[PDB]
Amino acid sequence: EYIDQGRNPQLYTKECLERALAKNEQVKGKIDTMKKFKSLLIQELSKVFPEDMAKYRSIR
Amino acid sequence: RQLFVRLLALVKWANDAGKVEKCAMISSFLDQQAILFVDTADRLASLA
């Protein structure tokens, strides 16, 4: 399709680079959200049941 | 003119033949990761 379009694959390369940058940004955002969720879960555990907090901190 | 365009396309494909395969593999891996993440999010939302 890109060959019949009449252009080179350089535009496809730039689009792939932009998609990779967007995927890296989305992965960073998802990792930040997962870290925030883990922090909130640890806080809820420490405020509710210290047994699970001690297990995750020393036993794991 | 058509032959010149075809030769330019062939040259652009031959100068970046392995790079094209690497970019395709990277794009496929990124798409698979995004699909897996979306599926996990949908499953978590449906379960919760």
């Binding site: 959200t33 969720f37 | 999010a41 978590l44 939302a45 919760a48």
Partner: peptide
């Protein structure tokens, strides 16, 4: 009343609301 069922239902509703809020914030001042 003052029975265990009231507090149980309250805790269940709170847990359900927390789960719904977490699901909403995970796929989104």
């Amino acid at each position: 009343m003052a029975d265990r069922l009231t507090q149980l239902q309250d805790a269940v509703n709170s847990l359900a609301d927390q789960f719904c809020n977490a699901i909403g914030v995970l796929q989104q001042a």
